[PDB]
Design a binder for this molecule. Structure first.
Ligand SMILES: *[C@@H]1O[C@H](CO[C@H]2O[C@@H](C)[C@@H](O)[C@@H](O)[C@@H]2O)[C@@H](O[C@@H]2O[C@H](CO)[C@@H](O)[C@H](O)[C@H]2NC(C)=O)[C@H](O)[C@H]1NC(C)=O
Ligand SMILES: *[C@@H]1O[C@H](CO)[C@@H](O[C@@H]2O[C@H](CO)[C@@H](O)[C@H](O)[C@H]2NC(C)=O)[C@H](O)[C@H]1NC(C)=O
Ligand code: NAG
Ligand code: NAG
Ligand code: ZN
Ligand code: ZN
Length: 392
């Protein structure tokens, strides 16, 4: 039985509340004829690359090792800078756990991936059958064409799993905030493509041969520049830092030798964030055992934003002159915050219909995908008992 997987980045749980579903006929049909969980709780940190790998390994970030969008290895002095620099392709960052598409390839099944971050990497010596590499933010038309092409590759047997990544709901949530009309517009365009998807599956006679699983990596919450910005240089000298990675809710610090205690005690006094020495990170994050986790980790309170200085803030290109746009939504915070929740839906012969499932965790999704794909899951942290009742 074929499997199509849609990762809708930054799709917050309440984007398809009852109220919202009244005007979302694509999602409403999927809910009415398939499975919808209350919400999907992401891993900490509720950032993209960590949670992509959680979703596709069933393992917490401290196990699959992809603990940040930005990571640094003191041993080799290499960085993973949100998949952009060349050294992001190093297997060093990806070989901490085998993701589902690699396991499928190794069992000699076929995998087509469309814009999926990571499909462009040789992971544990293996690559998917097809990777349409992520380069820029895919358009709504890119998304619709990728769905139609995925259906054709699954129907013809060129693919047994097809996986599609869509970013634009995340983009508009960032640029205009989670409750803005621009985010809603990007969601409506997805809803429409999902209506065509339902129609195309009927056109092509796939209804009995195909499950579709949709999920998101995290939600989105309001941020408040410039009031709720923490500037590290107000408290410490950056020259006392060997390395800093990322800006926003979760920032990794590497003090210079001899300055660890000094930097820690200076930043512990700062309100609206929490400074964790690595051995003191909260256990419920399932994060502190990751080898790339930094000696100090800064976690901002919801809505706050941490950077070296205000001028290092990630302004975006709203005017094509310089990057002067302010960000109005963000994510990455404490994964048990309501606004960080994502979604999980499923439809097809293997799933119950009109079934309101209890909320699940990001680690739970891997067992579902492996089950309907007919591959034995590698050991993981998902709970079968949390998901088993949605299956037909
Ligand atoms: C491009 O962005 C600038 C930056 O300012 C704004 O960024 C937006 C993304 C939005 O979140 C807004 O709230 C934020 O202040 C815009 O300049 C702003 O223009 C508005 C007029 O619409 C003024 O009221 C603001 O004072 C001004 N802000 C600054 C810092 O100058 C700009 O309008 C926007 N669009 C372009 C340039 O086409
Ligand atoms: C998450 O799941 C993994 C399953 O692989 C657990 O890690 C394994 O634990 C066993 C012992 O229970 C070891 O023999 C393996 O070497 C571990 N594998 C890896 C890759 O680390 C891990 O303990 C689980 N974590 C939690 C918090 O339950
Ligand atoms: C790491 O590389 C940078 C250049 O990218 C260099 O300036 C720095 O000294 C290096 N650090 C170590 C510890 O080798
Ligand atoms: C995974 O990557 C690491 C880092 O280069 C490497 O040491 C290891 O041999 C790789 N494993 C496989 C199975 O390719
Ligand atoms: Zn994301
Ligand atoms: Zn995002």
């Amino acid at each position: 039985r074929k499997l199509l997987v849609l990762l809708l980045d930054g799709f917050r749980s309440d984007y398809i509340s009852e109220d919202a579903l009244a005007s979302l006929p694509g999602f409403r049909e999927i809910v009415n004829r398939g499975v919808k969980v209350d919400y999907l709780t992401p891993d900490f940190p509720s950032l993209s690359y960590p949670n992509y790998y959680t979703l596709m390994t069933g393992r917490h970030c401290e196990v699959h090792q992809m603990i940040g969008n930005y990571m640094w290895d003191p041993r080799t002095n290499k960085s993973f800078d949100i998949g952009v620099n060349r050294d992001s392709l190093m297997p060093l960052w990806w070989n901490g756990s085998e993701p589902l598409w690699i396991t499928l390839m190794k069992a000699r099944r076929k995998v087509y991936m469309y814009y999926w971050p990571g499909c462009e990497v040789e992971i544990l010596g293996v690559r998917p059958t097809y990777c349409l590499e992520y380069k820029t933010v895919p358009t709504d038309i890119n998304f619709a064409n990728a769905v139609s092409d995925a259906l054709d590759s699954l129907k013809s047997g060129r693919a047994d799993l097809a996986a599609i990544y869509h970013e634009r709901i995340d983009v508009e949530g960032h640029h205009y905030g989670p409750s803005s009309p621009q985010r809603k517009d990007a969601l409506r365009a997805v809803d429409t493509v999902l209506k065509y998807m339902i129609q195309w599956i009927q056109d092509r006679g796939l209804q009995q041969d195909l499950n579709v699983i949709l999920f998101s990596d995290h939600g989105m919450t309001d941020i408040f520049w410039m009031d709720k910005v923490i500037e590290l240089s107000n408290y410490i000298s950056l020259d006392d830092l060997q390395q800093v990675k990322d800006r926003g809710p979760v920032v990794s610090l590497w003090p210079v030798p001899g300055k660890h205690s000094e930097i820690y005690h200076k930043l512990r006094t700062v309100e609206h964030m929490t400074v964790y020495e690595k051995e003191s990170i909260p256990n419920r994050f399932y994060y502190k055992k990751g080898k790339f986790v930094s000696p100090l980790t800064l976690v901002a309170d919801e809505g706050w934003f941490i950077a070296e200085s205000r001028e290092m803030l990630p302004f975006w290109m709203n005017s094509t002159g310089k990057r002067e746009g302010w960000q109005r939504g963000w994510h990455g915070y404490d994964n048990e915050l309501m606004d960080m929740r994502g979604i999980f839906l499923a439809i097809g012969p293997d799933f119950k219909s009109n079934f309101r499932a209890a909320p699940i965790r990001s680690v739970d999704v891997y067992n579902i995908m492996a089950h309907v794909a007919g591959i034995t899951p590698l050991p993981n942290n998902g709970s079968w008992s949390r998901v088993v009742s949605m299956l037909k």
